[PDB]
Amino acid sequence: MLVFIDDGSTNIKLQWQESDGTIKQHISPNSFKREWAVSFGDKKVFNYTLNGEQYSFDPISPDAVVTTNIAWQYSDVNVVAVHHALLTSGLPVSEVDIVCTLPLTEYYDRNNQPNTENIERKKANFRKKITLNGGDTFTIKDVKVMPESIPAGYEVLQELDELDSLLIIDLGGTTLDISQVMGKLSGISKIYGDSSLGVSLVTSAVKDALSLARTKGSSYLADDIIIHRKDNNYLKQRINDENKISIVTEAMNEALRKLEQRVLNTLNEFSGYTHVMVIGGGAELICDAVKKHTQIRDERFFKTNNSQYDLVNGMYLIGN
């Protein structure tokens, strides 16, 4: 079995194909604590051991430690989160080959050439042995690594003439990464990674507006408000009974304005692109400003409506 894994530091996205020809997409969050969970009843908990440390999936992990999520790519917790995503995907426990991801500035050095040291480091990370209490864990065999961004734009890149170029804008949970690649993948023109802002900027604003606990527990409510920010009818029913709808709508717009200004400022660093694509979980939050501020015809502007999965699907289309 071959599983494509975009192991982001906010959510692990999986994609694979079964025997009946159905193509499956699964998402599991990066939310673990460094201790086992205690269950006195029949609640299922997931308690792991890796490198001699205990970890467990935590549904209310604190939104804390909003720092270096680059180190996370080579961490013990990353190994746990990937195993946890596999364990909760619905696939049967088996040996699996996988293809994982490295952020553009980790996969590539400043010369836009493969950073072999990081690529190997990433593969080695998955050899760390893991155990699950009360169950069998999948076994990771072959590990291939793809860079983020490019796989998402590959289908389009194949169609572009070599002198044309696609600008791929990825807004993730904690970072905003942009790359410009020549048609038919004939070269990387520029990569600009930015780890100062992500969708969590908006999520944090929402949780502050509604004074929600700063944990994973309230992440769902916050995302729903954001996703349905333009539907008063939905907001009317969801918002914690009251009508702080005004104050939340306000906080959202402010964070969104920040994201939009950042992308437009960084966009000015790029030139000569002929096509534009916006991906990642936060794509819908910045697509309008980007389209408005680029001189690119509709026909050459790409955004799907399943953006958080654009990368892993591109990876699957390439390697499956």
Ligand X SMILES: Nc1nc2c(ncn2[C@@H]2O[C@H](COP(=O)(O)OP(=O)(O)O)[C@@H](O)[C@H]2O)c(=O)[nH]1
When binding is defined by CB under 8 A, the residue of 59, 135, 272, 319 that contacts a second copy is 59
Show Cβ contacts of residue 118 under 8 Å, excluding neighbours closer than 6 positions.
74, 102, 106, 107
- Given the rule CB under 5 A, which of 62-70, 91-99, 172-180, 222-230 is the region that contacts Mg ion? 172-180
Any contact of residue 238 with a second copy (CB under 8 A)? yes
Any contact of residue 281 with ligand X (CB under 6 A)? yes
4-40 burial: b if 16+ Cβ within 10 Å, else e: bbbbbbbbbbbbbeeeeeeeebbbbbbbbeeeebeee
When binding is defined by CB under 5 A, the residue of 147, 151, 172, 314 that contacts Mg ion is 172
Please classify residue 211 by burial: count the beta carbons closer than 10 Å to its beta carbon, then call 0-12 exposed, 13-18 middle and 19+ buried.
exposed
Show Cβ contacts of residue 112 under 8 Å, excluding neighbours closer than 6 positions.
188, 190, 191
- Tell me how far, at minimum, the Cβ of 315 lies from Mg ion, in Å: 11
- The binding track of 156-195 with respect to ligand X, each residue x by CB under 6 A or -, is ----------------xxx---------------------
Q: Which amino acid, 320?
A: N
- The entry of Mg ion, ligand X, a second copy, none near residue 91 (CB within 5 to 8 angstroms by kind) is none
Size of the site for ligand X (CB under 6 A): 18
Q: Which of residues 195-224 bind ligand X (CB under 6 A)?
A: 199, 223
Q: Which two tokens stand for residue 190?
A: 């520029």
Q: How many helices (H) and strands (E) does the chain have?
A: 10, 14
When binding is defined by CB under 6 A, the residue of 61, 73, 149, 308 that contacts ligand X is 308
Report helix angle 219-227 to 200-209, nearest 10: 100
CA distances from 196 to 36, 171, 279, 283 (A): 32, 11, 18, 17
- The entry of a second copy, Mg ion, ligand X, none near residue 155 (CB within 5 to 8 angstroms by kind) is none
For ligand X, the binding residues (CB under 6 A) are 8-11, 172-174, 199, 223, 226-227, 280-282, 284-285, 307-308
For a second copy, the binding residues (CB under 8 A) are 20-23, 27, 29, 59, 88, 217-218, 220-221, 224, 231-234, 236-238, 288, 291-292, 298, 304-306
